[PDB]
RNA sequence: AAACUUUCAACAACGGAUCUCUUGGUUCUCGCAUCGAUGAAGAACGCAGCGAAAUGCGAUACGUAAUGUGAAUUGCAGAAUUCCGUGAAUCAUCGAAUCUUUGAACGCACAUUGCGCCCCUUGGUAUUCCAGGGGGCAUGCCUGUUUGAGCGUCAUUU
């Protein structure tokens, strides 16, 4: 249970919350949890979701199904993932959303900032 | 007997009830003290690559600067190695600016995008005219400055 008067736990509240939020926060809304490999080898639970990860999807019609980001649609709250894709019936590949709290990071795009964080959340490389 | 009319069911018909939902209300509580002549609130007209609104903004116009974050924005399309970075973003923050015509609204007017006046600059063989660029000219009151007025009144005058 909470215990701080600034948290609120009111239902209403939260969810305007979520879907008013900023893209800055949809960032960290977005976060999608690392493979076992990835986590044994960094010390990382889970990371805000980037671009360029390479990511393989652990639920829903797609399960097993390995990719690298193509974009992070944090309007739509939602990662677009290449191959990851349906086929309408006209022949025109559409991109099939999905949410990172569905996926597992199986390779990190690393630049400064990326391991600095991983850093800063106690990974170590 | 049919058609027609009534009743019921099935399916199909405008209707949008019911059910479930809910970024909205409405009450209660706690904390805080911050509009404006340094031009407010409000109004008008404009600004997006493709748009007119309680979106945002002002000719620096869906915004500039500074800062943080750290790779977006996205309906479509795009300047660009913008991606191990003084750096994407309809991001956040926000202390620098810009802030059109107005508006208590301030040169005089205002059912007019109407008329002046004063400085400095530029152009027209120009201190006077015309034009352009910039900066100005409201009222009441306060303190001070300067210039005054009044046999209201003080120190010199046959």
Redesign the pocket.
Known sequence: AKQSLDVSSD??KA??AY??A??????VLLSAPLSKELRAQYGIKAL????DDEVLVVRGSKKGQEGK?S??????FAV?VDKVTKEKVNGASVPINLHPSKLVITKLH????????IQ?KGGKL
């Not at 900023?22 to 960032?27: D, K, L, N, T």
């Not at 805000?48 to 671009?51: L, N, V």
């Not at 974009?71 to 739509?76: C, I």
């Open positions: 239902r209403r969810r305007k879907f008013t900023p893209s800055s926060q949809r960032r805000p979701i980037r671009r980001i974009s992070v649609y944090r309007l739509k677009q690393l630049d400064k900032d990326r391991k600095a964080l800063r």
